Each structure stands twice: as structure tokens, then as C-alpha cells.
Design a protein around this ligand. Structure first.
Ligand SMILES: CC1=CC(C)=[N+]2C1=Cc1ccc(CCC(=O)OC[C@@H](Oc3ccc(F)c(C(N)=O)c3F)c3nc(-c4ccc(C(F)(F)F)cc4)c(Br)o3)n1[B-]2(F)F
Ligand SMILES: Nc1nc2c(ncn2[C@@H]2O[C@H](COP(=O)(O)OP(=O)(O)O)[C@@H](O)[C@H]2O)c(=O)[nH]1
Ligand SMILES: [Ca+2]
Length: 308
């Protein structure tokens, strides 16, 4: 045995960007890997591990919006990608769909990770509508290839970022909001592995809900005071940024963390919120953690799968 190990792999520009910002934000117990055709971007990566793919193919340039180049680049560097993944129990592959490198290389990276035995989760963006129909169509083909290669896929349409900004919100601030989805998902699973809960969930439960599943929702809700459990549950299952909503979920992993005041009744309330919002009979795998360092705060974390 061993404690399950997580790796986060950014593929292409947006994925590299997300890795850098996640490192800026602070992340423990996760190995970051930056993968790119673009050697200039890779040289600026904050990631401990860097893989320049397609050296012979692009000679250190990007893939110039041709997803076939990203795919061939990943295939040319297959052994390097294998060596960088080796040992991971879980791999998150993050990439912006629509360009040349991520669209083509990220599904190959995901396929390698899954063939190497890792639980493989993709977190990808679709391009803004203002980038045009061709970019959207190219990205859609990437999303489909991603879905065929991963265990579970989280898709963030970049157009959703236009729903959470005002007319002055800096573009980089909007990008950081999108980063929260992956980042807090990683932090949640890390905490799940590391702590023996009063009603415990561990990596085998993660595998049961996420293995070979397709579309997924991951979310988290923190609340306090009067209706804290219902509120936190509602916040966990309702991100404005995700393409896949909770509605239709057949499998759910749900954890509630609270202080010593965490009540049985409010645990039921929270679990019921997820049940009814799913509008399905949900196979729930339910966990609970008492963190006495919490006072009046409750945290609800949800991963939902089983839509397809
Ligand atoms: C700044 C700030 C204030 C507050 C309040 N916070 C902040 C920042 C962050 C960042 C993340 C969080 C909340 C994390 C969370 O609470 O996660 C619970 C985790 O579960 C656990 C955890 C421990 C256990 F002992 C057990 C168990 N019973 O042994 C247990 F179950 C959990 N992770 C997942 C999960 C499932 C799928 C996915 C994927 F994306 F991969 F698809 C990711 C995560 C689930 Br489902 O559950 N905060 B935050 F605390 F809100
Ligand atoms: N949300 C977000 N989307 C991004 C970011 N960077 C790029 N994108 C999106 O990702 C798409 C592909 O860009 P990029 O990753 O640079 O292309 P690649 O390097 O060829 O894979 C773009 O068309 C944008 O829609 C980012 O930092 N955040
Ligand atoms: Ca646990």
C-alpha cells in the first residue's frame, strides 16, 4: 500500500497558464507537470516537471491551431509522457480546447495516463464564442476525444465567464475564477485521502464514482449560521461555470465537514438537497468529517457522475 498520489498536468497554453496560477496560489502534496510544444512558454513554467513535446515536429514553436500537430507531438513524445506520469494514482489533465496543442495533445496525454493505470480526470475549457465557429468546432472535436480518453470530464465553456464578470472585471481575474474548479477539486480529493473521516471516504470511493463515467460535476459549498447545511449543499452543486449540471446525476460522492456542532438533521438536509436537485435516485456515497478547528462553518463537497 501507499497514500494515493495526485498529479496535475497542463497541456498547451491555457493548461500551462492554469498550472502556473495554481502554483502561485499554493498547492501541497500534488506534482505539477507542464506539457507544451511551445518551448518559450515551457521555459517560463513554474512546474517542477516540464515536457517539450513535438520537438522534431514544431522545433519549439506552438502548433499554430492545427490539432493534428498537437496529437502527433504527444505521440512523438509518448515515452517522455509515460515517464512523467509513472506512479500517479490520479491524474488531472487541464487544457484549453480550440488551439493546436491542447486540442490534439491533451486526449493523448489522458489516454496514456489511463493506460498507465491512473484515474484520469480532464478539466477543459471551450473557447469563447467571440473566437468564432471554426475554433468552437475544433474544440468540440477535442472535447469528444477527451471524453473517449478520460475516466471523467469537466467542461467549462469560456462563455460562462461572461456571466460572472461586470464590464470592468480584469480578464486575468476571470481566468482565476475558472481555475478554482480544478484547484479546489484537487484540494478536496487530497483532503479526502489524507484524513480518516468519522464516516470515511477514501480513494477507492473516488474510483467507484469517477471510473469510466464521462461527464462530471465537481463543486464545493461553504456556509455558516442559520441554514448553513442547505446553503452549503446548494453552493456545492450549482456552479455558473460548468457545462454539466447536477440534474440527472446517478452517482454522487458527497462529503460534509463541520465542527463538533455538525448535526445529524443538517447532514440529512444537505444530502436531501443533492438528492432532489439531481431529480434522480442517486447512488450516494456519503462521508462526514468533524474538524474541531471549524467553529460555525460547514463545507459540502460533491462529485456527481452517471449522466450518460
Ligand atoms: C479559502 C477556503 C475556505 C474554506 C471553507 N475552503 C477554502 C478553500 C478550499 C479548497 C477546497 C475546499 C473544500 C474541500 C472539501 O471539503 O473536500 C472534501 C473532500 O472530502 C473529504 C475531505 C476530508 C475527509 F476526511 C473526507 C472523509 N469522509 O474522509 C472527505 F470525504 C472531497 N473532495 C471531493 C472531490 C471529488 C471529486 C473531485 C474531482 F474534481 F476530481 F472530480 C474533486 C474533489 C469530494 Br466529493 O469530497 N476549500 B474550503 F474548505 F471550502
Ligand atoms: N479560461 C481560460 N481559457 C484559456 C486560457 N488560455 C487559453 N484559453 C482558451 O484556450 C484556447 C486554446 O488556447 P491555447 O491553450 O493557448 O492553445 P494551445 O497552446 O495551442 O493548446 C483558446 O482559444 C482560449 O479559448 C486561460 O488561461 N484561461
Ligand atoms: Ca478519508
Amino acid at each position: 500500500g501507499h497514500m494515493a498520489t495526485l498529479k496535475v498536468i497542463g497541456v498547451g497554453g491555457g493548461g500551462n497558464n492554469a498550472v502556473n496560477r495554481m502554483i502561485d496560489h499554493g498547492m501541497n502534496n500534488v506534482e505539477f507537470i507542464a506539457i507544451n510544444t511551445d518551448g518559450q512558454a515551457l521555459n517560463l513554467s513554474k512546474a517542477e516537471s516540464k515536457i517539450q513535446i513535438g520537438e522534431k515536429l514544431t522545433r519549439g514553436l506552438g502548433a499554430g491551431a492545427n490539432p493534428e500537430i498537437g496529437k502527433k507531438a504527444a505521440e512523438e513524445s509518448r515515452e517522455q509522457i509515460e515517464d512523467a506520469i509513472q506512479g500517479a494514482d490520479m491524474v488531472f489533465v487541464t487544457s484549453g480546447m480550440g488551439g493546436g496543442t491542447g486540442t490534439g495533445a491533451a486526449p493523448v496525454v489522458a489516454k496514456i495516463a489511463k493506460e498507465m493505470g491512473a484515474l484520469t480526470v480532464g478539466v477543459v475549457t471551450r473557447p469563447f464564442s467571440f473566437e468564432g465557429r471554426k475554433r468552437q468546432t475544433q474544440a468540440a472535436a477535442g472535447v469528444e476525444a477527451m471524453k473517449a480518453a478520460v475516466d471523467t470530464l469537466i467542461v467549462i465553456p469560456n462563455d460562462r465567464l461572461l456571466d460572472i464578470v461586470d464590464k470592468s472585471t480584469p480578464m486575468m481575474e476571470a481566468f482565476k475564477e475558472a481555475d478554482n474548479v480544478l484547484r479546489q477539486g484537487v484540494q478536496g480529493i487530497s483532503d479526502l485521502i489524507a484524513v480518516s473521516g468519522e464516516v470515511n471516504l477514501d480513494f477507492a470511493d473516488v474510483k467507484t464514482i469517477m471510473s469510466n463515467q464521462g461527464s462530471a460535476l465537481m463543486g464545493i459549498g461553504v456556509s455558516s449560521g442559520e441554514n448553513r447545511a442547505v446553503e452549503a449543499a446548494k453552493k456545492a452543486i450549482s456552479s455558473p461555470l460548468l457545462e454539466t449540471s447536477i440534474v440527472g446525476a446517478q452517482g454522487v460522492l458527497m462529503n460534509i465537514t463541520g465542527g463538533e456542532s455538525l448535526s445529524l438533521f443538517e447532514a440529512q438536509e444537505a444530502a436531501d438537497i443533492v438528492q432532489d436537485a439531481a431529480d434522480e435516485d442517486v447512488n450516494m456515497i456519503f462521508g462526514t468529517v468533524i474538524n474541531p478547528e471549524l467553529q460555525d462553518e460547514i463545507v459540502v463537497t460533491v462529485i456527481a457522475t452517471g449522466f450518460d
